[PDB]
RNA sequence: CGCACGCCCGGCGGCGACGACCCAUUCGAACGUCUGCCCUAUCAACUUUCGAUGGUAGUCGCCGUGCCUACCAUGGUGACCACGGGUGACGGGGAAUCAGGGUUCGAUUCCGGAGAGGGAGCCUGAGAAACGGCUACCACAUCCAAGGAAGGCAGCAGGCGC
RNA sequence: GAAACUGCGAAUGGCUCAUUAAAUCAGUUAUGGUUCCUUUGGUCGCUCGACUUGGAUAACUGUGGUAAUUCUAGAGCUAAU
């Protein structure tokens, strides 16, 4: 190409939005902002796709255009605008509030909040910053920044945000012993407690992380967010809390709720 | 005994006509656990792409070799000896890919047949993307 | 038009390179700015990200420093003596970074005789008739001179530069490219570099 | 650039020998006693059963 | 050849057709925007410059 | 620039659109690192003062570099197949065939590259050496009141030719 | 609300496979060696020295040239992010 490309074929969309092969032939590429292309959920898809409140693209148009929809308490009117990892999405209208969280497979649930828990949201900070006349700045997962943060914070901590003052409240150290959801990888949404830090000048770190049932699986550095201090998360975690049981277990726990059922 | 070039040769960092009433010498620990030798600290050339004593940068990749030929200034030809896999004869084949390096003066008697490590650093030359880190003499070379 | 890239040139080995793709934008090439010592001239180019760069074609003035004692003065260029590069860029008196020019000695005495209370150029018997240099070097306070004359401690100077002071006319090494930021910013040779410098000239000289 | 499946599939696989008076009389007997109308209704079963058999073989090789 | 002639102060325009060489003689090898005199043109445009 | 319209002796504030140097973020692009390709010896030597491999100083470039100048040094590649040649060769994910190995195919809807009749040069712009943009030169070619003028289907249809 | 000035887009998409044999390309990494419209979040009395200024142009009125085209010269008036 000569330039920036602004369309994506419905075969090389990310997965994990479960597109199906012969509705059409592009998919919705996301608009640029917050969160990367391959790692967002675009607002036509979650809305249309997943609530099914909207039939088609003209419905979405219609339901957001009317300043319906709040992404982090600041309305979009915007189809392919990327909602990602860790945001409040607030239909007002309806008086819902959803958290983009990772289910225990490689997608997005559905998780619906509380409007108290829906006034905060969970940021993994990426580089602390010296300003232009020593003004310490964050800049977190979501291209957010922050300036006079706490002079403790460093560059793989959590914060926790208020969503209209966009201030730090608390912040969560990465150490041992603290709940950490993955964020990459094959272990795409997995809950677990960390085990060890393993240092490597030059590539990587990898992490080790302890799952709820002595299940361990190590990820490198860059797909970890720490989301508890302990064993405590600090927001509401999805139906399972990112433990992914056995093909074998999955197919028992399925088969036998649908004996029961009948 | 330096400054043979038309221009003067001087280490850009440090300034040498400070008024008063032995020159410093900028140096730094490149990392990866590698020892900043003694004639980068002690010493008194002047070398743009010294690793230790100048401007360049290692990152990316750490390669080891053997020294072949040592002819042209300031750089040296290492042979990097592998086995290549072909799948339907279950066998390796023998194959070599010499590559050009930069030896900096610190490291002043190297001779061929020594196992020197280089690291990855920016484009010094045409040819050259390598910087010799340290050096293994060859096995004995005692007497 | 001018190509600066790899692929028209041959391999480690000396094989031909085949161009697979014709010249590209980004690989561009520009004429050289061979900037000269006249009036000021500088032209505008709009580069790639569409940011600005300046082409000093004609340059008389630059910001100088004589950073052995931290005085640093705009100051009116004459001619280039050396260049370690070519020697036709000498002949053709062109500006580029790593030259040797002689700068007005002027406004570094002005301020070293104003600062530490002694006389700089000025070889001896020339009578000082204009006497506001008389206000300058005469008539301190009381405990000023307990501080010009802790100052003047410190106050010489090395032979070399007192000659060329002497003369009026100083060597400066350009320090920032003239074609490419519309500048002759440098510093003023001292010691190590003034000693090699005029050696290589009485060399050319012969 | 068309939204499309183009995934096809044959669902019977003809035998090498065309002329074996064993397997001519066996498929025959086959195809009478069930009411087929051609060979292919018995070349599909025979290829359905021998994905299932060959599977079967696959997984009775696994380390237990 | 015709003449397209303007005033500016009253701003009206009228194209006037000449058939004449001797007339018009006065204009040629004369650069766009130079003030002619325009008397030569007709007994009508007595001292007018255009 | 637009809806709101206010708050006390002529005074007297929210909510948006647009714009703007710099910083981060996103979408990228660009240039490098390590390893990997079909046939050929009726291709055994190749490269280099008009850059071939290095050194110093600049020039140019969005930056790193022989990218290009000046002055030095005599290097760099090869039987582990370089250099040259052929390809009915765009590369890969893949496709047909298959006991196990394997052989042949991959112009073809997804990713990457290249090109808009053949080569070269440039304008504007964050982004192009852009052709459903411009400027010539070769080839072809349309309309001419004979002065001039306008071209580019390897886009969708469709027509000749093959 | 036609037109027209202004901003933006036209560099994506679509088509073909002629070039091209360490080239393209694939896996792996680097920019501590760079540029970036837009999106998003910061900055936007940090500088010690006017209750709104300036003069053109287009559309429009008017007069034309050419066998000719999304060609255009001349005149009079009037806007701005």
Known sequence: ARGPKKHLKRVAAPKHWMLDKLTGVFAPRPSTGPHKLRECLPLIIFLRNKLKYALTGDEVKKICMQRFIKIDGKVRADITYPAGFMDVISIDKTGENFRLIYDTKGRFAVHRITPEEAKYKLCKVRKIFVGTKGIPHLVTHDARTIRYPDPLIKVNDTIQIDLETGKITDFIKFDTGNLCMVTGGANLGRIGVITNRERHPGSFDVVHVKDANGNSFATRLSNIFVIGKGNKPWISLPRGKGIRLTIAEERDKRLAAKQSSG | DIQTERAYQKQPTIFQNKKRVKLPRYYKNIGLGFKTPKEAIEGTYIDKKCPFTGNVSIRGRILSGVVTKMKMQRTIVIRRDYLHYIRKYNRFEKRHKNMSVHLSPCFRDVQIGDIVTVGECRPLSKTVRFNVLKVTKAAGTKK | ?206 | PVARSWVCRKTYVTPRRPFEKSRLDQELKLIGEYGLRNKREVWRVKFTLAKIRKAARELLTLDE | MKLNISFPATGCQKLIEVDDERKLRTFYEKRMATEVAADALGEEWKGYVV
Not at chain 3, 38 to 62: F, W
Not at chain 3, 126 to 155: C, F, G
Request: hydrophobic share 25%.
């Open chain 3, 1 to 206: 038009g001018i190509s600066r890239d790899n692929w028209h040139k041959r391999r480690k080995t000396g094989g031909k390179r085949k161009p697979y793709h014709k010249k590209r934008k980004y690989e561009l090439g520009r004429p050289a700015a061979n900037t000269k010592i006249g009036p000021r001239r500088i032209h505008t180019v709009r580069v790639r990200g569409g940011n600005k760069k300046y082409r000093a074609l004609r340059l008389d003035v630059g910001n100088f420093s004589w950073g052995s004692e931290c005085c640093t003065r705009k100051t009116r260029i004459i001619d280039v003596v050396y260049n370690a590069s070519n020697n036709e860029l000498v002949r053709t008196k062109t500006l580029v970074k790593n030259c040797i020019v002689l700068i007005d000695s002027t406004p570094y005495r002005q301020w070293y005789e104003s600062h530490y209370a002694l006389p700089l150029g000025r070889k001896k018997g020339a009578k000082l008739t204009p006497e506001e240099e008389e206000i300058l070097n005469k008539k301190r306070s009381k405990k000023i001179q307990k501080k010009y004359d802790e100052r003047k401690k410190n106050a010489k100077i090395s032979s070399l530069l007192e000659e060329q002071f002497q003369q009026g006319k100083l060597l400066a090494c350009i320090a920032s490219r003239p074609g490419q930021c519309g500048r002759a910013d440098g510093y003023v040779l001292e010691g190590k570099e003034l000693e090699f410098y005029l050696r290589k000239i009485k060399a050319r000289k012969g």
